[PDB]
Design a protein around this ligand. Structure first.
Ligand code: GTP
Ligand code: GTP
Ligand code: GDP
Ligand code: GDP
Ligand code: MG
Lengths: 432, 430, 430, 432
């Protein structure tokens, strides 16, 4: 199978990626020095060279020099091609306008050049994985830019992303609703499907299951690394019933706008706690169908599932996966919409996970990642829309935007567009 | 003489194909390197039925492997048995279908189908008398469903007279491994009823039911399910490859098993099936073998034959056997379950006996059935299709690759007629 | 020829069954692995009477083992003799009856009975001439009483013509090992009188009385009581398995031992019975043997024959013997105890002689009796039933599994009639 | 035979269980470290794992962290799955209302989740054994909760329990009658049969037969361990005339409400004292039919037996058991009710008891446990009802309850319900 390009935008995406690429190095046994120790898989995510040093096929962009500087000076400095690390001069300062209109465009073209110079050097190409956040300038405004530009230059190719959605109650910035909605509007028409994640839900899981009292960003971003490696496992490792990258959108996207499947991973168990667990197929399969196991803090029983992919990993029994899924289809609490009787998409790859040195999670012999699309996520959008209406009703932060080349009417258009999305979910939530 | 050229499309087809050629190489006693090392002269007398010959004894099977992306083919070439195949026969794209029928049939399969035809013709001209074509694919997928139906039509146009049979995996009744199976399944049937002479419907759930029920082997990987399918399909072609008392033929089965042109969907069956260890507490005589062919428990199609009625049935026996019992039991079977067979056909059972049993066995019978109960499957797909199509659940992935929703309505309408036609023969005479 | 298919239900049935097959394998000289190792050709001439044949000499007995929970069956499979049985014949549930008739007949036995029938039919079709069915169960329990009566009815419907005899353990007169024996016992009789041709009533207390009285072996475990029962039942089927001067048959005994349809409850008996060591001070001639069959001390039914009157009696002898004495003694017996036999039957004794005695013996006689004294047992159960049912002692455990107390009244009323019918024949002629 | 789930609620149930599970470990030779030393029986009470460490199939709940903390830090810490040990923050404080209405419900759902996650992983399931007391908050109020919840989620499956009944004169709390009656009312309609035990009677036995002057809770709870192991012996060990779990209720419960068979065990003899005893079947069988041998201090001759199970253990003679029981049926002092002539239920398992290291009781080659249901227990209820009437007549403790979400009328309803139970026994005590 063939190549994929990973774009890491903003502090969150850039910081998340460094953890993700640590896994790829471990799985294929690539040295942090870049030189593979003395096979057909790494070609998808790594570029060959005359020497033994493989070059990762990804680009990092961040208007603030600080974040990339840590990578550019960290022990992984030699792994990345120096010209792939694009850095501006000043930060976007959490303002959507700066990262999209004034300073985002001053460096966007340079990023396109390297991607173009990178996409041209792959005999095959699947799509893009874009890592970013919803609550920052570079990770929200610059993302919207690249979705537009990459859509034009490389349209009709898959465009996937993993976005840190604003958590329900915990908040890390004041202008998250303003910046969160804006990027959503511009990215709906130029994206395939977004893999939402919340730090609140992940924190809730980490203190609950993993059983470590004091998590950090350096900890959580690694779990987000596992979902990516499991998602991209088909493109690298052989196994029965593979699932190529272009397959995700077809199964998980009944409608063009409705492309927000929240991520769910299992089993998250610590090394010590695992000795008293059996890890049967239904056990791990059942873990994905409860409020207590989500990367987004949306109560699934509030809504109805409409598409679910169970990308199994490691030594797995297809017979049990077929049987385990069948039971979940016949439980009253679980409720698939009326119009999608065919609501599962199984995928198996014969490569059990690999543990990061010193990693908190255990060495599970078998793993599964669920990518269910549920109408309960409309609550997250509904709550977010409530926040935006409260602030913009008083016009309490617009001035920071109008001064950066963003017209007043944009805010009104976005919410009205989001309001239609709210109704779109409601219509799909019923049966004609 | 009556050469077979094998076509395999999609991940399921290649994986079944790969296992399918291991057994035939085993039956004929062919080394993985392509060098014949069997012990019976009957293996070389018909080795040309599947295998071409290059100087030096290197026998190159004439299988055509097509998948829209190198994923599954690369595994085959790297597999222990992959060196046997001709390097040219492999045909690989660079962007696999995303399970959607349109891309693998119209926009991506079209760019690759012409390349495949260029090799299939070379195989056709190399055979003195090419009997027909054999296709192994899956309806649920995109590459198998799309390019298989695209290619089955193209080979149909060039060689209308020849047989063109297919082995396809059919969506399971209650489990689905792909969300959009009804769309791909319904679209693929519409294009098949009009172009294929026979179809051996199989489904994983029914085959799963065999693994643990009659056999006792929990954790049966796809590599084992394909072996059951491999064995059944190799039985259909046995008479072409070894002598027998009552030889069968790909055209013989088509004539007997297909009363009307459209009603050619069969469902296979195999025996003897018994778990290791417990095998020694069971006899291998013909009587117990025959009963194992006429019970739902040993049917590889999820549809239960009891609900419906049998139209035509063919039993292809193998090994040294008493032809009396091979025909006495069929008569008793028909009188025992007369209600299970329609009255308007005076006799329904077709018997064929071969001399060489399967490798590692002294008795084998590949059952084939044409029952009205299969209408339940297509009716079930109709139930799922109308539900999804009533709201345009996923039409945008299809119309975006050069397709019109008018085709979906055409396929649904045709499918309903196929179900109706089966129903009309539920009634008795007069 | 006249094949027997054995049915065993309940913990008592399986345990008696398990011992029951050890002796027959011993008589025919069958190795525990299923390989015949006897020394007499007469053991193979009729080995098909009980044992099917799989290639390699592995003889698979056609016994059907059913219990609602894996408890007792797992012990059998783990036992030294458990490897002989076919793995499929074992039928096991996952929730055993709690001694209540309703659960094992209606809610739990129903979900499992269909599975058993699927295997019993396979045994029936494998026999050229299936004589009849044999059931070993217990009335006191739930699985034996419930599923045995549920299954005895189902096999009755399919094969009304065939014989269907039963060996059942009956509640003891003064001891009870289950609190609700009268309810299960009365319910089970109602369903048996209408469906079974003969019943060999036995009770542990009567069999306990044999262990220490005539034998001298204190601490006789159930494993020994079953051996006595095993030996008696193997005697009934001897003529079907070995030659004799005057051969008997399962139908022969039914015709002679059953004057009226309902009055088919017998009570068995066996001889010679003597303690080891003291055996050498006793002779083995026919005379002393016959007297041992017509005394209450050697009756396996708690009811004492003296209180009642004999209707029909069958003596099945074995081994080389003087047919004169085998019939002279019966005439003397009848004249000695003329008061013990009813006048309206001119002669009551049925004699059968076989050539092959039991393994390890040179003489054997399985006594069978049909006496009116058995009415005391059923009358005793009636006494216990009316006491409990007069206050609905445990009806809530029964009505809670899909049952109505109307059935209890029906069973009690039928039981009373059975007692009355026996009583009517106490009187003499005219 | 297949699985059973043991629930240990309250300090008594939790403390009793730790002694019970010590026996199971010894009988099957399971190491306290959890790893079986280098067969088909332990599957009933123990869950397999990929490693050799078997996980006990039981759940422990106690609102007071102290009791479970001792287990969670004791030498048996590794045996139990960490998530099975459910602990609250504050104690129930002997108040029925707290353990049932205010704080009991704050943690009940978590217990149900683990049982549900545990019941789902057993191919077969027999029922539940619930260990608790009548004189505490958690062991009385939380029990009533689980009886209700487990009845709904797993109804029609056996629900057994071993309850420490309030002793006649010795009392360990002031509000035992208030809390004792309340749990009885709510548990009658949602229970199968309760195995009553009194510390007074056990203490009377221990100083009388066992001949140790200074017993303790750590001592008595072990004898209660023997009755449980004997009761559950059929589900594990092979033997003639087994008695499955569902069989107990049918024989011992003539009527739905009348399901209180008091426990009686024999022979309780010390290691030294045993050398002068023969232990014949009638001897051990006769020990169970006298006032001097009961786990509940009710004089049996006051009432009439109406159901009796003699679950024999070890190498036993079925002939003698049949004979020994018959003699007991023909003694004038012993008096079975008129309407139950069939008043015995024998059960034999070929597994003689095992001795706890340092245990006081002797190494008897044969054992028997009697579970007779007698009308004399009505005296215990009658005496308890007298205590409740005295206190509630003066309304002397209601205030602690009304403040915890318990209405006044509940007390009146309970006693009136208990009064009917008193009459119910009286009606069954006569013949129509
Ligand atoms: N999972 C995860 N989330 C992060 C990480 N770093 C930041 N976030 C989240 O990202 C959001 C803040 O956005 P950032 O990415 O820091 O901001 P930025 O993209 O650099 O944008 P500006 O600094 O405003 O230009 C908050 O929701 C943070 O919780 C990380 O390493 N992992
Ligand atoms: N047999 C036995 N009885 C006990 C044990 N511990 C306590 N008891 C009895 O249980 C009753 C007291 O109830 P506890 O279990 O201590 O109270 P609790 O269930 O923890 O309830 P609260 O502490 O009020 O929440 C008294 O009758 C004690 O004699 C024990 O280890 N064994
Ligand atoms: N029998 C069998 N079925 C398979 C195998 N692999 C995939 N399938 C089935 O094929 C369907 C998925 O289609 P696939 O061929 O993978 O998609 P495609 O590559 O787009 O044609 C599902 O119904 C699977 O159950 C296999 O090795 N054996
Ligand atoms: N002869 C004999 N009788 C038994 C044996 N085991 C149990 N019983 C009797 O069977 C009755 C109990 O029924 P059981 O078969 O265990 O209950 P079920 O499993 O529900 O049918 C009692 O009368 C026991 O005396 C045995 O091994 N041999
Ligand atoms: Mg930043």
């Amino acid at each position: 199978m063939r190549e994929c390009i990973s774009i890491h935008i903003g502090q969150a995406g850039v910081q998340m990626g460094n953890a993700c690429w640590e896994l790829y190095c471990l799985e294929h046994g690539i040295q942090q020095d870049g030189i593979i120790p003395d096979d057909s898989s790494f070609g998808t995510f790594f570029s060959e060279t005359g020497s033994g040093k493989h070059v990762p096929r990804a680009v990092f962009v961040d208007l603030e020099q600080t974040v990339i500087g840590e990578i550019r000076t960290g022990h992984y400095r030699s792994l990345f091609h120096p010209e792939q690390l694009i850095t501006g001069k000043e930060d976007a300062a959490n303002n959507y306008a700066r990262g999209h209109y004034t300073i985002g465009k001053e460096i966007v073209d340079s990023v396109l050049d390297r991607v173009r110079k990178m996409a041209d050097q792959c005999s095959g190409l699947q799509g893009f994985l874009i890592f970013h956040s919803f609550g920052g300038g570079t990770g929200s405004g610059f993302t919207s830019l690249l979705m537009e530009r990459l859509s034009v230059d490389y349209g009709k190719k898959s465009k996937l992303e993993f976005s840190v959605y604003p958590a329900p109650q915990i908040s890390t910035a004041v202008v998250e609703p303003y910046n969160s909605i804006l990027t959503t509007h511009t990215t709906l028409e130029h994206s395939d499907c977004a893999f939402m994640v919340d730090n609140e839900a992940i924190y809730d899981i980490c203190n609950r299951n993993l059983d470590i009292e004091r998590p950090t960003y350096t900890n959580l971003n690694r779990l987000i690394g596992q979902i990516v490696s499991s998602i991209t496992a088909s493109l690298r490792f052989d196994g029965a019933l593979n699932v190529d990258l272009t397959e995700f959108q077809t199964n998980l996207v009944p409608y063009p706008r409705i492309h927000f499947p929240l991520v769910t991973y299992s089993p998250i168990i610590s090394a010590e706690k695992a000795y008293h667990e059996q890890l049967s197929v239904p056990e791990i399969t059942n873990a994905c169908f409860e409020y207590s196991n989500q990367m987004v803090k949306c109560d699934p029983r509030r809504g109805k599932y409409m598409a679910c992919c169970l990308l199994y990993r490691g030594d797995v029994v297809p017979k049990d996966v077929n049987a385990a899924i069948a039971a979940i289809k016949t439980r009253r609490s679980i409720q698939f919409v009326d119009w999608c009787p065919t609501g599962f998409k199984v995928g198996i790859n014969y490569q059990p996970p690999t543990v990061v040195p010193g990693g908190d999670l255990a060495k599970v012999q078998r793993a599964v990642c669920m990518l269910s699309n549920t109408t309960a996520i409309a609550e997250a959008w509904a709550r977010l829309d409530h926040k935006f209406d409260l602030m913009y009703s008083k016009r309490a932060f617009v001035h920071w935007y109008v001064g950066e080349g963003m017209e007043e009417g944009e805010f009104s258009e976005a919410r009205e567009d989001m309001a239609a999305l709210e109704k779109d979910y409601e219509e799909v939530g019923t049966e004609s | 003489m009556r050469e077979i050229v094998h076509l395999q499309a999609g991940q399921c087809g290649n994986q079944i194909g790969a296992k399918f050629w291991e057994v035939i190489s085993d039956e004929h006693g062919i080394d993985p390197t392509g060098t014949y090392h069997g012990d019976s002269d009957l293996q070389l007398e018909r080795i040309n039925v599947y295998y071409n010959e290059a100087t030096g004894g290197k026998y190159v099977p004439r299988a055509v492997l097509v998948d829209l992306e190198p994923g599954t083919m690369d595994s085959v070439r790297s597999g222990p048995f992959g060196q046997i195949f001709r390097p040219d026969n492999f045909v690989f794209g660079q962007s696999g279908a995303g399970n959607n029928w349109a891309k693998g049939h119209y926009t991506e399969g079209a760019e690759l189908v012409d390349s495949v035809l260029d090799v299939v013709r070379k195989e056709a001209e190399s055979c003195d008398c090419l009997q027909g074509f054999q296709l192994t694919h899956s309806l649920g997928g995109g590459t198998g469903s799309g390019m298989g139906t695209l290619l089955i039509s193209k080979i149909r146009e060039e060689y209308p007279d020849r047989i063109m049979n297919t082995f396809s995996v059919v969506p399971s009744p209650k489990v689905s491994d792909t969300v959009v199976e009804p769309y791909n399944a319904t679209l693929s049937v519409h294009q098949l009823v009009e172009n294929t002479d026979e179809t051996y419907c199989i489904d994983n759930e029914a085959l799963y039911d065999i693994c643990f029920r009659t056999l006792k082997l929990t954790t049966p990987t796809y590599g084992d399910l394909n072996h059951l399918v491999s064995a059944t399909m190799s039985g259909v072609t046995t008479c072409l490859r070894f002598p027998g008392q009552l030889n069968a033929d790909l055209r013989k089965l088509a004539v007997n098993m297909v009363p009307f042109p459209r009603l050619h969907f069969f469902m296979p069956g195999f025996a003897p099936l018994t778990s290791r260890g417990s095998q020694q507490y069971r006899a291998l005589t013909v009587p117990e073998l025959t009963q194992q062919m006429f019970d739902a428990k040993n049917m590889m199609a999820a549809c239960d034959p009891r609900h419906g009625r049998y139209l035509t049935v063919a039993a292809v026996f193998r090994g040294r056997m008493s032809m009396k019992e091979v025909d006495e039991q069929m008569l008793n079977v028909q009188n025992k379950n007369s209600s299970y067979f329609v009255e308007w056909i005076p006799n329904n059972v077709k018997t064929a006996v071969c001399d060489i049993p399967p490798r590692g066995l002294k008795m084998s019978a590949t059952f084939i059935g044409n029952s009205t109960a299969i209408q339940e499957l297509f009716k079930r797909i109709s139930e799922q299709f109308t539900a999804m199509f009533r709201r345009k659940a996923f039409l945008h992935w299809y119309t975006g690759e050069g397709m019109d929703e008018m085709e979906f309505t055409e396929a649904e309408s045709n499918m309903n007629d196929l179900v109706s036609e089966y129903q009309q023969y539920q009634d008795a005479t007069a």
